[PDB]
Design a protein around this nucleic acid. Structure first.
Ligand code: MG
Ligand code: ZN
Ligand code: ZN
Ligand code: ZN
Ligand code: ZN
Length: 1223
RNA sequence: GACUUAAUGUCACGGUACCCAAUUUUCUGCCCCGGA
RNA sequence: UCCGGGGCAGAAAAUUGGC
């Protein structure tokens, strides 16, 4: 009679706003959602209401379930036969029903004795309500032979509490892009999944068929179901506004976005990073502390303010607090700066006689083989019922209300339909609102396939994948192109459920299941979700146990267990003997190699190209946001990803370092782009270029999918990350800039101990032979070192030594005369200043025709220079990773002692010093701008140092005014440098300068190194900037070596340093990779490397002390278009670089140019080859009472600084004339 | 009860939020004259 | 009339556009 039944959902069911049938046609969302749960509004304001399922929808699910139940038993149920029913109402007889059937109606052979009427009817006709007083117009409730009441939600209620408006999608198969999209309210089944309704039934004759069909209704409102018969955001925004205003007080509004990113990544670290003060604390003796976390907000530091914020907001979660405060810091930073929905016929379908219809349930685990991404709209746009940009995360991952990662049913079905279309070899694009069912072979099996929404048992916050678009022309970031993606970890496991209701299990669906399988030999190939081309969402199907119900003989056991709907998790973990009755294992599951549609359609669909990248350089794919939130306290640390482990059911405690798949993708896309010229196209709208076919565009998906490059070598490194300090040296003052000092934390890669980066990509079936050749050429381009991975590639980072592909796929003969003063004074009595200034002039040529990076120009020169660096003096390149490298700070506290620079033991010179000293030589040689200049530094006074410097010598800001030749070759902030200086590895020579008195014999305690003082170079306000400071080549290191005892006892230990020093005669080899260089530019760069026989370079510490005279000798110039450039063409390159400087001024003899003659005598080596000259070069002491003063000489700053003895004009021309006598 | 259904007919599990985009560009861990 | 002294320790740019 009154059968009160209960409807519980086991996945997120779809909800829609209720409209009456006259008003339902006005809204396309409700017309599309006629088969959903309905939502009316209660009260006013459209904020509260109540969800329900219409009884017509429950009747439609039941009547569909009766038809399938009667088709299994040939129109019978428990003995009593049933007729075919009726599913046709005439329009002339009466009004049509509110829902018209479009599907095929399951029919049988009518074994009923008499016809069905009002006097006596079959149980099919009773449950249809064919012959009762109730009809198309409802008047009263007891006219119904069977009544279905509305199913109210068994829980006023707000719509945001129950449902979340999610934009779903329709992806085109051929292009891989969404044709259109539509929005549904996927309501939460864990709190609001239970629905209670009433089913009245006057006739007892259809009682057994009704309750069994209640147990046979598998899905309703988009969700699997069993039917059983019974404000801190405001205060966070205010405090974020306080923090933004406080940052605006120190003129640091640009750091608020950095802080908003850094707060949003603190949800991964837990509350202990703020509670236990695990944020980095700045330098060891820095009064300013950290540059971000110690910014004074209302008089106290930002770390203490975040402590107070977390104590004030401890009632919410740490994840929610870091998400909203990171969002609110982002939102206030913004104030201070194809939607598509949707002739009736009756289709009688009778199954063949004696056929066997089975229910194949596939329970498995969707393991994320790659980091994954499932797309969702922004939470501001995800609000249901509410159908300046405000996106802190550009792409959020789809989560629950419990923040667990979600594979939707829709995205699993869409990837299954795509893979079944591939497996069948044909298919349809899914037409919407069609009156006729699609007869395509995919849609037939899609109608038989039922899946489940899977959620991981994991609710940790998503990792953030920052992506940029590189500007093709400048090889810097594109203006505007920076965005972030919430991704899930690899190894994450999702409960996979597939249900097939059909006669035979199709050979194409079992092909897709075996395609998705990880198994042993193959890879798991379930591409689910979005950004697949950047390897987001390649899932593996593991722990597969396909079971099968028998629905023709054991259909009561299917109804009794309700198809194990919602109990599929228990189905995956029980044994074989613990299975319910009627559920047998499917032992006839076809194997991988015995499948006809798998072998020719799915297996060759994406071809794996796995390979290992040999990185013989320190690899830095920078994660600056993670650098701010980690206690290592570096400005740039290498990228690492959190990887979930299914064995430990948690993230692995050591994050795997990786070059990002997006970086892996964009290097290949650049490499094809500059080889084809497709990177230089202005727009790629409706483009069928070679790079747009391969890598996709705004319209087509990519035919290549790139995975992350796993560091598979990290266990073999004792110290896997190297600390490399970096600094920018002012061109006028030989020391550091006023703000430009920093450090990187790359993976410690070296030529003898390289980093192995195992990464793979996938190649689409149908790839052209030219397109296959372009990828291998791009693969060979990375193997040939043309594209360094990560940041600082021009400084020597991420240089690729080679690529291993897996099996399953010269002298410069110029002699400068030098200076006459050391040649005339052969007794070494004459005393010279350690540095002199190069006053080249105020004429800087700026090329507005900026050389593009978008292609390898055929007339321009690209290649590699192998250079041997020979130390002419003892050379100091300190390993400033350890301030106690020589292990002597116990005896001398505060005495900073460094080893020589080394990565994984072997002695290295970083290419930053090789680039920076060559840049300082190239900018001096080419009359360039002062690219690193202390403009903000004052004098002791009318103007700053930037006022004293000429406007042409000022550093190049932007590309609009042109670039100076040093800034054109070596780059600006708006332009990647076209030269790349590798790290110099050690080969041969006497390794260490051995001193008997020092506690390490290889070491040397030096004199003190104080900051360069512009007041000596600029004595008054009437004097300009003297020019580029260059240090002389002298053997004043021999003085320091012989007073090692005296230096250590009359100089305070924390004032000077002790360093491991090479001896004279050591050979280093660095590669200078160059791209798109001129005929004259390479020759000037070759001249900048090897300027002459007696000309060298000053490198590393102790340049005023005579250390670091390095002789760079070119071994081999190799250029590609790969060939070896002969000596005749190398000299011919250098000749056209000479008349380029001649045309700027208005056997190359470089001494006839006045600024190159002064520069080359500044870099002239008087003690080179067979020469008895040993010029004495040292700075004056202050007074006669200062230590290190030779008695009887006037070499003091009291007399040289006195205007009466040495006038101010004479001191500048004594400083701007190299090798001038100072004593 | 109503909110909130229509009953001889709901393929909406009929629709992958998908497609593009290299956290990168520049920068020598360097260094001498004063301070009240 | 006095006999020393460390500095910088990141700066700038993009923080989303198109379909
Ligand atoms: Mg009726
Ligand atoms: Zn009947
Ligand atoms: Zn179809
Ligand atoms: Zn294109
Ligand atoms: Zn410049």
């Amino acid at each position: 009679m009154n059968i009160t039944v209960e409807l519980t959902f086991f996945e997120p069911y779809r909800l829609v706003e209720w409209f009456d049938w006259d008003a339902r046609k006005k809204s396309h969302s409700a017309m599309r959602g006629q088969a959903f749960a309905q939502w009316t509004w209660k009260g006013k304001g459209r904020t509260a209401g109540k969800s329900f399922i219409t009884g017509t929808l429950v009747r439609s699910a039941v009547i569909k379930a009766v038809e399938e139940l009667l088709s299994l038993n040939n129109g019978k149920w428990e003995g009593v036969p049933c007729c075919n029913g009726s599913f046709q109402t005439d329009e002339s007889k009466g009004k049509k029903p509110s829902f018209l059937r479009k599907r095929h109606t399951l029919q049988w052979q009518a074994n009923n004795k008499n016809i069905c009427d009002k006097e006596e009817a079959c149980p099919f006709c009773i449950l249809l309500g064919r012959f009762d007083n109730a009809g198309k117009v409802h008047e009263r409730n007891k006219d119904y032979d069977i009544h279905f009441s509305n199913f109210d939600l068994d829980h006023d209620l707000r719509l945001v509490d129950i449902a979340s408006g999610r934009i779903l999608n329709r992806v085109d198969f051929d292009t891989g892009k969404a044709k259109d999209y539509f929005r549904t309210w996927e309501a939460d089944y864990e709190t609001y999944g239970t629905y209670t309704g009433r089913i009245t039934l006057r006739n007892e004759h259809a009682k057994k068929l009704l309750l069994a069909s209640l147990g046979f209704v598998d899905k309703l409102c988009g969700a699997l179901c069993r039917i059983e018969v019974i404000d801190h955001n405001d205060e966070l925004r205010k405090q974020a506004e306080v923090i933004v205003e406080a940052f605006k007080q120190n003129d640091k509004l640009e750091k608020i976005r950095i802080l908003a990113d850094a707060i949003r990544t603190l949800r991964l670290h837990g509350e202990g990073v703020i509670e236990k003060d695990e944020l980095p604390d700045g330098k060891e003796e820095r009064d300013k502390g950290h540059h971000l976390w110690d910014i004074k907000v209302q008089g106290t530091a930002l770390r203490t303010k975040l402590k107070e914020l977390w104590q004030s907001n401890k009632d919410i979660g740490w994840r929610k607090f870091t998400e909203m405060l990171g969002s609110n810091l982002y939102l206030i930073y913004k104030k201070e700066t194809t939607e598509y929905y949707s002739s009736d016929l009756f289709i009688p379908v009778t199954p063949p006689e004696g056929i066997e219809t089975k229910e194949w349930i596939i329970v498995g685990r969707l393991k994320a083989a790659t980091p994954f991404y499932f797309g969702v709209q922004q939470p501001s746009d995800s609000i249901p019922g509410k159908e300046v940009i405000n996106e802190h995360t550009s792409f959020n991952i789809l989560l629950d209300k419990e923040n667990r990662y979600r594979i939707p049913r829709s995205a699993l079905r869409g990837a299954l339909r795509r893979d079944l279309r591939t497996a069948f070899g044909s298919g349809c694009n899914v037409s919407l609102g069609g009156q006729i069912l699609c007869n395509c072979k995919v849609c037939i099996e899609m109608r038989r396939i039922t899946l489940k929404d899977s959620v991981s048992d994991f609710s940790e916050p998503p990792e953030i994948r920052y992506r940029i678009a590189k500007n093709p022309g400048t090889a810097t970031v594109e203006d505007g192109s920076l965005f972030d993606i919430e991704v899930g970890p690899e190894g994450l496991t999702f409960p996979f459920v597939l249900r097939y209701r059909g006669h035979k299990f199709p050979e194409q669906l079992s092909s897709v299941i075996r395609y998705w399988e990880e198994n042993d030999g193959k890879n798991g190939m379930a591409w689910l979700g979005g950004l697949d081309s950047t390897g987001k969402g390649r899932f593996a199907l593991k722990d597969i146990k396909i079971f099968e119900w028998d629905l023709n003989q054991k259909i009561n056991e299917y109804i009794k267990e309700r198809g194990m709907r919602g109990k599929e998790k228990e189905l995956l973990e029980m044994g074989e003997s613990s299975l319910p009755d009627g559920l047998i294992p499917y032992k006839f599951f076809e194997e991988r190699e015995c499948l006809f549609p798998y072998k020719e359609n799915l297996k060759p669909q994406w071809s794996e190209v796995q390979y290992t990248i040999e990185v013989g350089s320190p690899l830095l794919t920078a994660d600056t946001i993670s650098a701010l939130t980690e206690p290592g306290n570096r400005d740039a640390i290498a990228y690492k990803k959190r990887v979930y482990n299914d064995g430990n059911n948690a993230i692995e405690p050591e994050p795997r370092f990786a070059v990002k798949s997006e970086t892996h993708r964009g290097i290949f896309r650049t490499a094809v782009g500059r080889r084809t010229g497709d990177l230089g196209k202005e727009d790629h709208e409706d483009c069928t270029c070679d790079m747009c076919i391969i890598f996709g565009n705004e319209h087509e998906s990519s035919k290549i999918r790139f995975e992350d490059l796993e560091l598979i070598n990290g266990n073999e490194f004792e110290k896997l990350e190297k600390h490399i300090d970096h600094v920018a040296i002012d061109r006028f003052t030989g020391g550091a800039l006023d703000k430009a000092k920093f450090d990187t934390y790359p993976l410690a890669g070296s030529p003898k101990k390289p980093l192995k980066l195992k990464g793979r990509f996938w190649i689409k079936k149908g790839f052209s032979g030219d397109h296959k050749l372009l990828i291998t050429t791009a693969l060979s381009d990375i193997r040939d070192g043309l594209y360094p991975l990560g940041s600082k590639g021009g400084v020597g980072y991420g240089w690729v030594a080679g690529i291993s592909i897996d099996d399953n796929v010269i002298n410069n003969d110029y002699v400068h005369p030098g200076h006459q003063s050391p040649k005339q004074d052969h007794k070494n009595k004459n005393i010279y200043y350690p540095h002199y200034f190069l006053d080249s002039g105020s004429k800087v040529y700026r090329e507005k025709d900026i050389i593009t990076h978008e292609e390898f120009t055929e007339e321009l020169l690209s290649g590699k220079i192998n250079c041997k660096l020979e130390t002419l003096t003892p050379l100091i390149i300190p390993d400033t990773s350890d301030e106690n490298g020589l292990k002597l700070q116990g005896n001398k506290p505060g005495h900073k002692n460094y080893k020589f620079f080394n990565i994984n033991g072997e002695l290295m010179i970083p290419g930053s010093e090789l680039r920076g000293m060559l840049r300082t030589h190239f900018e001096a040689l080419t009359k360039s701008c002062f690219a690193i200049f202390g403009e903000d530094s004052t004098l002791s006074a009318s103007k700053t140092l930037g006022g004293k410097l000429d406007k042409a010598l000022h550093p190049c800001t932007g590309l609009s005014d042109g670039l100076c030749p040093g800034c054109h070759l070596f780059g600006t902030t708006d332009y990647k440098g076209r030269v790349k200086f590798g790290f110099a590895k050690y080969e041969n020579g006497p390794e260490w300068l051995i001193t008997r008195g020092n506690n390490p014999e290889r070491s040397l305690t030096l004199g003190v190194l104080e900051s360069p003082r512009p007041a000596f170079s600029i004595p008054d306000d009437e004097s300009e900037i003297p020019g580029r400071k260059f240090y002389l080549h002298h053997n004043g290191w021999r003085i320091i070596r012989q007073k090692q005892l005296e230096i250590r006892e009359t100089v305070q230990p924390e004032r000077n340093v002790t360093t491991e020093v090479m001896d004279k005669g050591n050979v280093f080899s660095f590669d200078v990779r160059f791209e798109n260089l001129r005929e004259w530019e390479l020759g000037l760069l070759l001249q900048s490397l090897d300027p002459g026989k007696n000309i060298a370079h000053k490198l590393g510490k102790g340049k005023p002390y005579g250390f670091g005279s390095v002789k760079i000798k070119i071994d081999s110039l190799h250029t590609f278009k790969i060939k070896r450039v002969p000596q005749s063409d190398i000299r011919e390159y250098i000749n056209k670089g000479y008349q380029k400087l001649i045309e700027w001024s208005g056997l190359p003899q470089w001494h006839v140019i006045p600024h190159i003659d002064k520069l080359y005598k500044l870099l002239w080596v008087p003690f080179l080859n067979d020469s008895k000259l040993e010029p004495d070069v040292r700075y004056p002491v202050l007074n006669e009472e200062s230590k290190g003063y030779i008695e009887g000489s006037d070499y003091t700053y009291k007399k040289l600084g006195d205007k009466d003895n040495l006038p101010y004009k004479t001191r500048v021309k004594g400083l701007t004339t190299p090798w001038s006598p100072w004593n």
